[PDB]
Amino acid sequence: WEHRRFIVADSRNFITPEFPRDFWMSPVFNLPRETAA
Amino acid sequence: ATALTEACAAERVVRPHQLSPAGQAELLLRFPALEVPLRHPRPVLPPFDIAAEVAFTARIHLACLRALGQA
């Protein structure tokens, strides 16, 4: 045998991360068509 | 390879796009293979360059980055 606790993977299991306010104004999510790279 | 240097060496010009149209039309009369890299609006490669392939793989790399971050 084996004994363990057990948490069911139901599709109602969500997760809520928190973003900073100036997160999406980052120089990688906003790239021009022609960079120096 | 002889003409494309000497036509630019006589005019002291480093890049054959900056050549005068009196000089550019002279090469087209002798050498008709130079139509596309001289008289094309938007070539997929940068013409008369050496890293022209090396630019090309670097442009698809950028276009696949902005495909991610916008999505």
Short mmCIF file of C-alpha atoms in Angstrom, two decimals:
data_model
loop_
_atom_site.label_atom_id
_atom_site.label_comp_id
_atom_site.label_asym_id
_atom_site.label_seq_id
_atom_site.Cartn_x
_atom_site.Cartn_y
_atom_site.Cartn_z
CA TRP A 1 0.00 0.00 0.00
CA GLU A 2 0.81 3.68 0.17
CA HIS A 3 -0.83 6.51 2.12
CA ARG A 4 -0.76 10.21 1.29
CA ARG A 5 -2.90 13.30 1.33
CA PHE A 6 -4.47 14.28 -1.93
CA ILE A 7 -5.71 17.53 -3.48
CA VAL A 8 -8.00 17.13 -6.48
CA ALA A 9 -7.06 18.86 -9.74
CA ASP A 10 -10.36 20.52 -10.59
CA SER A 11 -10.62 23.08 -13.39
CA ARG A 12 -11.95 25.65 -10.91
CA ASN A 13 -8.41 25.88 -9.48
CA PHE A 14 -7.23 29.32 -10.52
CA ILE A 15 -4.37 31.58 -9.50
CA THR A 16 -4.24 35.36 -9.05
CA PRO A 17 -0.89 37.06 -9.63
CA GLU A 18 -0.37 40.76 -8.99
CA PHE A 19 1.25 43.00 -11.47
CA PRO A 20 3.15 46.23 -10.81
CA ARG A 21 1.59 49.34 -12.29
CA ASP A 22 4.55 50.07 -14.60
CA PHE A 23 5.04 46.46 -15.66
CA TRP A 24 3.70 46.53 -19.22
CA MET A 25 5.55 49.79 -19.98
CA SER A 26 8.74 47.76 -20.34
CA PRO A 27 11.30 48.16 -23.15
CA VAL A 28 10.92 44.54 -24.30
CA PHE A 29 7.14 44.27 -24.61
CA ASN A 30 7.35 47.55 -26.58
CA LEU A 31 9.82 46.99 -29.39
CA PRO A 32 10.17 49.08 -32.56
CA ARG A 33 10.34 47.50 -35.99
CA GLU A 34 14.11 48.15 -36.25
CA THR A 35 16.24 47.98 -33.10
CA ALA A 36 19.98 48.33 -32.63
CA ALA A 37 20.25 44.60 -31.86
CA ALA B 1 33.70 42.46 -59.51
CA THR B 2 36.08 44.62 -61.53
CA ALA B 3 33.49 47.11 -62.78
CA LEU B 4 31.53 47.58 -59.54
CA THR B 5 34.68 48.69 -57.72
CA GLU B 6 36.23 50.87 -60.43
CA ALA B 7 32.96 52.66 -61.17
CA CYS B 8 32.91 53.58 -57.48
CA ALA B 9 36.67 54.18 -57.28
CA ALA B 10 36.52 56.76 -60.07
CA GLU B 11 33.86 58.70 -58.15
CA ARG B 12 35.33 58.20 -54.61
CA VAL B 13 32.02 56.68 -53.47
CA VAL B 14 31.87 53.89 -50.90
CA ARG B 15 28.39 52.51 -51.77
CA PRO B 16 27.02 52.01 -55.31
CA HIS B 17 23.59 53.40 -54.38
CA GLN B 18 25.18 56.84 -53.95
CA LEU B 19 26.56 56.70 -57.50
CA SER B 20 25.38 59.37 -59.93
CA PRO B 21 22.65 58.26 -62.39
CA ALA B 22 24.95 59.13 -65.28
CA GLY B 23 27.33 56.52 -63.86
CA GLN B 24 24.63 54.07 -62.80
CA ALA B 25 23.08 53.89 -66.27
CA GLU B 26 26.48 53.12 -67.81
CA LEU B 27 26.73 49.86 -65.85
CA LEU B 28 23.21 48.86 -66.91
CA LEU B 29 24.13 49.14 -70.60
CA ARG B 30 27.13 46.82 -70.33
CA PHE B 31 25.82 44.59 -67.53
CA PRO B 32 22.05 43.91 -67.56
CA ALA B 33 22.23 41.58 -64.54
CA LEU B 34 22.30 44.66 -62.27
CA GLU B 35 18.65 45.60 -62.83
CA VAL B 36 17.17 44.11 -59.64
CA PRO B 37 19.79 45.31 -57.07
CA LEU B 38 19.71 48.82 -58.59
CA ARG B 39 16.08 49.47 -59.65
CA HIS B 40 13.90 47.75 -57.05
CA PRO B 41 11.81 49.47 -54.34
CA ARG B 42 11.81 46.97 -51.44
CA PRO B 43 14.19 44.03 -51.83
CA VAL B 44 13.95 41.30 -49.20
CA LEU B 45 17.74 41.46 -48.85
CA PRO B 46 19.73 44.68 -48.51
CA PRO B 47 21.44 45.06 -51.89
CA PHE B 48 25.20 45.48 -52.42
CA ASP B 49 25.99 44.36 -48.88
CA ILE B 50 28.06 41.57 -47.38
CA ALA B 51 26.11 40.72 -44.23
CA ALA B 52 22.93 40.81 -46.34
CA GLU B 53 22.16 37.22 -45.40
CA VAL B 54 23.27 37.96 -41.84
CA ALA B 55 20.81 40.86 -41.70
CA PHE B 56 18.04 38.57 -42.95
CA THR B 57 18.12 36.02 -40.13
CA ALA B 58 18.32 38.92 -37.67
CA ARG B 59 15.13 40.47 -39.06
CA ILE B 60 13.01 37.34 -38.73
CA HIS B 61 14.33 37.04 -35.17
CA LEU B 62 12.94 40.48 -34.38
CA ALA B 63 9.61 39.80 -36.11
CA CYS B 64 9.15 36.70 -33.96
CA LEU B 65 9.86 38.65 -30.76
CA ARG B 66 7.16 41.26 -31.41
CA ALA B 67 4.81 38.43 -32.37
CA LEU B 68 5.20 37.19 -28.79
CA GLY B 69 5.10 40.38 -26.73
CA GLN B 70 2.07 41.83 -28.47
CA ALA B 71 0.20 38.55 -28.02
#
